């Protein structure tokens, strides 16, 4: 039924493609469609994210998260992440994905990608694996 | 509130939107552009179906709730045609989480190119000769 383990899987494959995205960026500027999707790889890599501490949290009996909020907290209380307001930040970010076709937003968006949150998916999945290994 | 409002964003959206699918036709579109495809498909259709959310509103129908509401109205009011694809959209929407898997993204962009910008175009052509009155 619920298996965290799995889940971390895909979301290892969701942040490689953020990964690429991301080391494209940093050999030329993206076009604004190119923006738009970095936006939408954050998407897919951030809902991996927080399923993944769901369901971890499940193993240990807890039952009572819900969303990305929920998870984003217990994740935190119990050191699964270390930069508890820029995962909030994310959770902010996905709050604004109906609004990306003004610019502004879809910079804002993807400065934060950029500069933290890929660090962030990165310092989680490294974090899951050793876990999983015990 | 104000239908007209969020069908001038609805317009807005679309002519982004529109850009990205008349590119495709210049040349294949790369991984990550596919991704902004499906990104601009999701802020154009959340636009669409809340402007009709909205104009039914203006109607007295304060039932509509999310996207298969308001398109079901749609239709059986005549402000869109093609029913199928408008219900096809909502399960491309239901996707987006899944579009790494290339299979998912592909299958999106397909529809997005093929059928869903046409959908968009009349729809907003429907709305701006309602808004004339
Ligand atoms: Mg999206």
Redesign the pocket.
């Known amino acids: 039924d619920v298996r965290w383990q799995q889940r971390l899987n895909n979301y290892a494959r969701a942040l490689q493609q953020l990964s690429l995205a991301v080391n494209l960026a940093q050999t030329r500027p993206l076009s604004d469609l190119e923006k738009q999707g970095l ?2 790889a954050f ?2 890599t951030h809902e991996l994210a927080w399923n993944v501490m769901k369901d971890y949290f499940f193993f240990a009996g807890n039952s009572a998260i819900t969303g990305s909020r929920d998870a984003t907290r217990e994740s935190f209380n119990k050191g699964l992440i270390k930069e508890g307001e820029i995962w909030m930040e994310m959770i902010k970010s996905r709050n604004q ?1 109906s609004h990306t076709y003004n610019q502004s937003v879809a910079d804002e968006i993807v400065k934060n990608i950029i500069n933290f949150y890929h660090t962030s998916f990165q310092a989680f999945l490294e974090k899951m694996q050793g876990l999983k290994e015990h």
């Open positions: 936006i939408q998407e897919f994905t």
